[PDB]
Symmetry: D2
Subunit: 310 residues, 4 copies
């Protein structure tokens, strides 16, 4: 897929970021992963990000990433598949080329590792990664990699395959500046960990889509929120925030990393055994999982037969 085609797909709907399934031994479990991705496919997200943050990119060995991407591509159907990428330049370029080779439709570039860096350095790093591949690139403003608007403009001028901007800062002042400066040169993607909490505000900032982490386990609910958002049906969005998202946030906020762990637990609850998270994430306790199960409530995909005797 050429960069203008993935750019178009990014603007075509809600974004899917699947958890990466592991077996009990912590190995990638492709059979489980494909089963789950296949189910998600029925809900018609136009872009799937394999091995992104919700997919535990940050705990994968680089040689696992093309394998995960290719597994997703087996069952994605008409969905575009974007790969996570990240770390310092040398590692990032190798990952980018390796996922381009297995047929990724783009890369989502997570921060480099560890250090704070000057704008000129961010520029040089991101430029080198974009020039290493022909597929589309989305940059991700978060943590220790936060592009200013002028730096991003320079990158856009020099790197035609740079077509998306995902925000994880929550900095409205900055992201509205970026959309004012770049206009339709870029597609703007909401990227806060539970993005529906930000989506109505982010419309005003110029963002009409986002990654929905909870789409992993309540896609019907996530799809309805998104449709209501785009239709301006505020009371519908608000009901879903009050009845599902703020209660979810109360679970998510119980421990560091639960923005991922709670999503993975949700997937398990819906009958897909996505397995444990990798350290240094920790899984929800069985009690916490029961809180989430109760919250999912009417949105359950199945019924469980819990073991019981007489």
């Amino acid at each position: 897929m050429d960069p203008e085609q993935i750019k178009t797909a990014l603007g075509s709907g809600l974004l899917s970021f699947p958890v990466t399934h592991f077996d009990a031994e912590g190995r990638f479990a492709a059979d489980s992963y494909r089963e789950h991705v296949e189910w998600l496919a029925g809900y018609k997200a136009p872009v799937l990000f394999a091995a992104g943050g919700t997919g535990e990119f940050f705990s994968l060995k680089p040689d696992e990433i093309p394998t995960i991407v290719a597994a997703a591509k087996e069952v994605a159907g008409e969905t575009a598949i974007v790969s996570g990428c990240g770390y310092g330049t040398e590692i990032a370029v190798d990952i980018a080329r390796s996922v381009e080779k297995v047929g990724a439709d783009g890369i989502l570039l997570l921060p480099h590792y560890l250090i704070d860096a000057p704008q000129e350095g961010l520029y040089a790093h991101i430029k080198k990664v974009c020039q290493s591949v022909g597929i589309g690139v989305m940059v991700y403003n978060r943590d220790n990699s936060v592009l200013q608007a002028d730096t991003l403009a320079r990158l856009c001028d020099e790197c035609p395959n740079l077509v998306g901007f995902k925000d994880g800062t929550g900095d409205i002042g900055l992201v509205r500046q970026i959309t004012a400066k770049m206009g339709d040169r870029l597609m703007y993607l909401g990227g806060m960990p539970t993005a529906e909490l930000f989506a109505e505000a982010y419309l005003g900032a110029g963002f009409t889509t986002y990654s929905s982490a909870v789409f992993n386990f309540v896609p019907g609910l996530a799809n309805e929120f998104y449709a209501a958002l785009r239709a301006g049906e505020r009371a519908t969005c608000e009901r879903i925030l009050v009845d599902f998202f703020y209660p979810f946030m109360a679970i998510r906020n119980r421990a560091k990393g639960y923005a991922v762990s709670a999503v993975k637990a949700g997937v398990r609850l819906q009958g897909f055994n996505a397995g444990p998270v990798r350290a240094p994430l920790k899984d929800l306790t069985n009690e916490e999982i029961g809180m989430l199960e109760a919250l999912i409530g009417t949105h359950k995909r199945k019924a469980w037969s819990h073991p019981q005797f007489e």
Copy 2:
């Protein structure tokens, strides 16, 4: 007026926070102040906040505050007048009562002083201030006083005159939760230092007005942006952001406190004798004042207007 009346006014348009004028000795300059406030009133903000943040509340002696509120009220016309209030509970209550006596239409309660406090303590502090007066109260989430939605709900249940919520945190996740919880029980006010940068986003969060600090010196431009915002004319809002506000931010960001200092410099450049800032703010350098003058450009206040 009564709380429901200030509540209604707060939702009727763009809000103004006038700078407080000082003479050379640093004393309140009421003639200059009234002259400026009268001019601003011509641009028809339905509420002006006297002695708020932009008005250097944090540098005022408490006996100066009713004097300033009174001076505003003299020449405000129909425009409603809300007073700044703040500090610890004992001082805040004395200020609140003093400004109620000179006819304030409400109070904007800035943070208590210095310390971080538990939600239960914020609740006790704000409740006591609300209960000390009969005029309307707007709370202000910022710095060391950030109410969670459940705490704010409790306050709303027990203090009927609490009618407004101003945000200076920039925390979208929290303010959207607040508007979802409280709905029309409160009026929601955008309160970032240069709030136009946030206004289009804050609409989505449930906020349809804000304080415009730059209204102090380019009220026509501020009014033009507000009109375009409420009308959905995005290309207009964007022009004004790119041409005026991000360049203004570049000036504002040159030093701490310039969110106030640059606004006061703009007022002086437009021919209102606002005087210096009080320490620990500093005034813009002559180079910086020059930058701001050039930026005001075609919006310069002209003798022939």
Copy 3:
């Protein structure tokens, strides 16, 4: 006394900040306060800071501050009394003059209110407060008022009554630069909320005293720690850290503001009628109070 004399006293031992006593109605309880301050003076701190942070300065009306300073002065004996001061310049100056009039031996200038300020602005603010009185001044780096070394140097050059520097930032890098720059021009006071946690490190940075908040209710233990610190008995300092201070920190960290509220709870446990904290602080729960009582243990009065 004159600024050079409060300077000397500041460097002559352990400092503390008595809690400010309130009745049930939250009004200043002078009788109780004097009873407590008199007991503390018995434990021979050379300087007590009236209406400082531990004394809830941030919740006092400006006209309450000289009343409290005066109460401490009645019973302080050989102890010098320094007054808290703060807010913006206009209020700070009024406070500074009002407590100088009731006999304050110095002022501790807490941060101004609310706003972030540029260094030139801090300089102008602090200079004006210093020049408004003849008694000595200690500046207080914390929160929204943090002086760089060069700004402080300029203040020192222009204000001879500026004689003390208290740190509440915990920024070791910055405070070592300040002591290297100023040398013996200033006395350096450790000012983290529970300062014994920092005292051994601060020695190396050039600070040999600090305010002990817990001196309020275990002055004997606080003195014991201080003596071992200056005598370089590291095993004694470490025992007291492990047995008393980290367990105290565990209680303190349960809620915002407990660096004050827990100390006030300790004072009440020692039989002084210090009363409640003022909002927006909250008092410890009964559970927490019992935790603190259990920790005070053999130090019970």
Copy 4:
């Protein structure tokens, strides 16, 4: 060596973290690196950390790290060689084993990548890395990996080869708690980016050594500061702070990442071909190089 031997070496002097030398194309330049490491050897730091932070660990491909370690080992003499290590567990374990294989004497474990993590998660990660090798491990409290004292105690009880603790937080309250709790179970290493600014304070906290990044280009000056520190010669420490370190900081504070870039510039000014930094660091401007040259002054290694 075994972990108790590297533990002893950590307590025997100043720690050296050499910059990693690159050619103009950004590739590792082993000949220049060895020239520089050989020169440094004359100043007798007891432990050399190859591909640490100052060595741009965070910009190295994992396959570069053992080559760099082997290069250092060629010329470092009777000196303990510790390798940087980091990232998530899967990557960290492979790096750890690869540098053990080329004869590293220990690993300095930098943070995992990107995420904030719960204490039990940090525990699980660091335990797994420690158990993957037999050589000594030093943990590095900084950024998104900050161990609390109780978590660290649990790791110490379960991993006998965990023998060092390096701090990059600057949190005195915490590091003093950690030294009180663990005592001589661990060697305590100062790790703030220009550590001499912190060293006198950190003594009281229980730390008697640190990484001297500036040892890269003024090792005689760094050695004298260290000697003065351990001797209690406060006026000497202060003179060196005022005349050299605060001026160095003024240069260092001009841009993000200059804690590394300025050190590398200093090495180039002393006549070693250390080359450019890798993005996303940037090199000092010509003006800035000039400021640093002037500062080095009497300490120049050559004309």
